[PDB]
């Protein structure tokens, strides 16, 4: 998933 | 001599937006700290500090009163330190959680909201009589010492  | 256990609920809701914002935020989310059921943790919680990712402005978010929550929009999940500070004058003065704010749960269609709950049990050994009363007012219970 999109993670930052 | 005395051991008091009390419960906190940490959780979040996330949902894909019907249209991304002008900044490109694709999801709306809310993270919170709360009592279980009927339990009012304001009796023993002085404040909750949520440390947002530094992409967010003023990322140290403080709630000194309920609801203890942050509501934001974003484009990615991140690790969020959370400090729950107590109305006590002895250690432990707070508890530090590291919350996984995720925007996608496998098995969940992204259009559908996701909800996550973390039930955390706190243990206090030999609390002050004042703090013991606050803990018990918030649903705490005394158990086998140590």
From Swiss-Prot, chain B:
Site feature (Acylated histone binding) residues: 100
Where is the region Acylated histone binding? Answer: 53-55, 75-77
According to the entry, every stretch annotated as the YEATS domain falls at 1-138
Q: Where in the cell is it found?
A: Nucleus
Q: How does it assemble?
A: Component of the super elongation complex (SEC), at least composed of EAF1, EAF2, CDK9, MLLT3/AF9, AFF (AFF1 or AFF4), the P-TEFb complex and ELL (ELL, ELL2 or ELL3). Interacts with ALKBH4. Component of a SWI/SNF-like EBAFb complex, at least composed of SMARCA4/BRG1/BAF190A, SMARCB1/BAF47/SNF5, ACTL6A/BAF53A, SMARCE1/BAF57, SMARCD1/BAF60A, SMARCD2/BAF60B, SMARCC1/BAF155, SMARCC2/BAF170, ARID1B/BAF250B, MLLT1/ENL and actin.
Q: What is known of its domains?
A: The YEATS domain specifically recognizes and binds acylated histones, with a preference for histones that are crotonylated.
Q: Which disease is it linked to?
A: A chromosomal aberration involving MLLT1 is associated with acute leukemias. Translocation t(11;19)(q23;p13.3) with KMT2A/MLL1. The result is a rogue activator protein.
Function noted in UniProt: Chromatin reader component of the super elongation complex (SEC), a complex required to increase the catalytic rate of RNA polymerase II transcription by suppressing transient pausing by the polymerase at multiple sites along the DNA. Specifically recognizes and binds acetylated and crotonylated histones, with a preference for histones that are crotonylated. Has a slightly higher affinity for binding histone H3 crotonylated at 'Lys-27' (H3K27cr) than 'Lys-20' (H3K9cr20). Acts as a key chromatin reader in acute myeloid leukemia by recognizing and binding to acetylated histones via its YEATS domain, thereby regulating oncogenic gene transcription.
UniProt-recorded name of the protein: Protein ENL
Name the gene behind this protein.
MLLT1
Full-protein positions shown: 4 to 146 of 559
């Amino acid at each position: 998933a999109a993670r930052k | 001599q005395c051991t008091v256990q009390v419960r906190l609920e940490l959780g979040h809701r996330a949902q894909l937006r019907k249209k991304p914002t002008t900044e490109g935020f694709t999801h709306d989310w809310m993270v919170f700290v709360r009592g279980p059921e009927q339990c009012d943790i304001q009796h023993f919680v002085e404040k909750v500090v949520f440390w947002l990712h530094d992409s967010f402005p003023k990322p140290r978010r403080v709630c000194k009163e309920p609801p203890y929550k942050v509501e934001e929009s974003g484009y990615a999940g991140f690790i969020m330190p959370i400090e729950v500070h107590f109305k006590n004058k002895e250690e432990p003065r707070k508890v530090c959680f590291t919350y996984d704010l995720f925007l996608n749960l496998e098995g969940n269609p992204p259009v559908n909201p996701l909800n996550h709950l973390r039930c955390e049990k706190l243990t206090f050994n030999n609390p002050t009589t004042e703090f013991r009363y606050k803990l018990l007012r918030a649903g705490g219970v005394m158990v086998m010492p140590e």
